[PDB]
Amino acid sequence: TEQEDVLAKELEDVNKWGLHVFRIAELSGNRPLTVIMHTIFQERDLLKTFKIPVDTLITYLMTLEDHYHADVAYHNNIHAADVVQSTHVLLSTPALEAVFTDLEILAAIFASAIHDVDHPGVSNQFLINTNSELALMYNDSSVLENHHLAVGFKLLQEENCDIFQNLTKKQRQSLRKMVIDIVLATDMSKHMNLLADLKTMVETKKVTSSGVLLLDNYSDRIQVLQNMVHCADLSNPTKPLQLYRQWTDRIMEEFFRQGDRERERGMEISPMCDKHNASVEKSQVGFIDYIVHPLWETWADLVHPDAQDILDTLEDNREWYQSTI
Template identity: 85%
Template sequence: MDEWHINGPQDLVTVPQCIQNAINKKPLCSSITYACTGNHSPTPCHTHLFQFTSLSLCIPDLGNGCACRRSPLGGVCVSPRATLSDQQYQQLALDTLEELDWCLDQLETIQTHRSVSEMASNKFKRMLNRELSHLSEMSRSGNQVSEYISSTFLDKHNEVEIPSPTLKDKPMSHIIGVRKLSHSSSLSSASMPRFGVNTDYEEELAKELEDLDKWSFNIFRVAEFSNNRPLSCIMYAIFQERELLKTFRIPADTFVTYVMTLEDHYHGNVAYHNSLHAADVTQSTHVLLSTPALDAVFTDLEILAALFAAAIHDVDHPGVSNQFLINTNSELALMYNDESVLENHHLAVGFKLLHQENCDIFQNLTKRQRQSLRKLVIDMVLATDMSKHMTLLADLKTMVETKKVTSSGVLLLDHYTERIQVLKNMVHCADLSNPTKPLPLYRQWTERIMEEFFRQGDKERERGMEISAMCDKHTASVEKSQVGFIDYIVHPLWETWADLVHPDAQELLDTLEENREWYLNTMPQSPSPPPDRHLQQDRFQFELTLENLEHNNHNHICLKSGRSSRSNQKAICDDNLKIKNKKKDKHPIKTPNVDAIVTLSPEMCQTVPQPLSNVASKQCVQGRGWGSHHEAMKLWDQGQQV
């Protein structure tokens, strides 16, 4: 096994020698196989170029003198292009595409999918770090936004100072947060309310539920008319519409008992992560499951698992972040070893509640069905950990680009890894769907999340802790945080999802653009404070990846106030979230990835860096994503505080 690189030494992957020869454009047989026999022709191979998750692979055309094993076409030998008729050449193209499909199947078989996704994830992280480093220089609030995005959506393992004294020893054999409640005594199938909840506003509620299948659904009105039982009402309505109670023989009274018990374990005094948010994510997941591109793709069990995962994904949320729980040495952090603390807890509570009286909604599933459902739900809820965002996005982007090349663009999810990948991203998209909703709804969600952030900041201030990014009510910029949130996180995710289900999500992207523009236009237009040397030293330091080293060492790497820059190098970008060097090295050096925090004095920086906003391609202005924060950058460059 040898190593080869794509678009530079930073993108390394292990592949068979045969594939390496293909990438190096050596004369080879018509397909990428494990074994080739015969005399290779000295005639250079024609090549086809296809895009694969922002990485370019060169696949050789059919050459002379080869006999291939395990290829669909066997050992077909074809003359060079000059001796082929148009009909022969067209047939050659079709045969090559067929072999390309076969080739990708082999790559999946030898489990290179993870390597490709990891390369994409690492590349996305480098691009995002570069953008955030530039944003952090613009103003104090810009630095806060950058730090928040980096600390929340990038999976980093920072050193944590555990405060003392530690908590007293407590028995941890039980799942904390689970309370014994009883709703079953007053429920029966004969007396079941129309929408699963008792309310004096049944007609008004019925009117709102007519829009259950719409993305513009107003969950706030449902909460108002359902006696503040939005999750119970939404779950009952969706399960009735999809006939899941009938399909899985779930008794109606058992179902309502469980969802009411589940809803009671969401904290009403938490501003954002409460049962209203759970109901919103559940309804959004319901709509995404109904998108035409995914019609008849998922089984009833997978649909059941996705809706259940959405309903429990934040149960018993305390209103603080994972990092806060870790920093305060909380019992939950100790129980789950600092790994996806809240997500693990939500799962434990959600499944534990099934054991309460008349709450086992899965009692009539077979053992195999229960095991499959549990695995699906665990995978989906753990994927709601925002620190896993870049990995999810890279996996989804890899799938989208692969499907563009194979199967005539038809979405085929044949394996569990592919199906769960889409389901995880679906729930993740639903969890990050607020900016894609109509502006009045989006603004309410923004007010709620900022209130929750500020409450955490107050707790940190009272404890003498460092206040987390975007949690200081005295310095946080709500408008700027939303613009940055959309540009760096939400739009890249939803744009990739829209590619997967094209053209079904275009309306959502349009709404996202409109909401982004609204927040951009409401930013306070005040001059930025002058640079302060002391503040510059306190700025958040971003990870810098050393990449694309050249023989002549023309690239000077400089990090000042968390910013990376390169001389004699311009970047271009496109709407597929790719940033490439205009000038490619003919003989790039094979160098492993080096991730480090690089701190250099100003004297060591031998060149004046160019902001990415100054060299970003104009085509990015119409879209969002890394390298396309152009309008906001222009305002900053003009000395305005955005």
């Protein structure tokens, strides 16, 4: 059709920060995760490298996409698609050229795709406070993030879904470990510790003779990939404003809906979740000043100057939201 050529044209931007991911969700028939993952796998030659049969890739991607909730405004398949594509661009940065194996690239991108699957649109703390089945199963520790990993790996077992069927045993074992390490690190309560280790690596940075970042050991390697996917997760305020604003609209609907459940249950309402006492603009500014900018400023230092434009957009968007109060 012609509609698929409009999508093919939009998928030419897959290597650019600020891809119009909502448009790709429209043109793909609510399949952004599938088409962006497929496009990225092609672009990085991962199907040939890992002997992934193309029909197995599509079947798994669609089943994965299916297990994101379409009735959750933020933590859905579009967010998933966005984090995948943002990680993809972050992998491409000059300061990281030829740093990561094809297996590590594969783990980072797969982790990003599964990283929020079957998110119910409420927080870990809500799930703990309400004595949810999820919290009971995972003993109040990385409750959502454990669940995303369990669902993401378990779907590889569905008919014609094992996109890793042609990896060696040791490649599967290494990848499984790296993916778990990555997604468990997206637990928001780990951000401070994650950023502290990132600062320390920035303060003791070492580059090779090609001016490219030097990582001697699994600990440093996995930690860079953990922060990379965490940054991609918290990248909405680094995007062009017309994108950023829709992500704000979507997170506040989710947060407001959680607050209405907290309120009905007699609970104290979570930060930013009270629709009767909200301050969306001041919260975005606060969230950038205390969380997103300290994080992205540190990442920008790690890959300096590759990330300068991304950080400038972040600063402009913070200025814009500030100007509305």
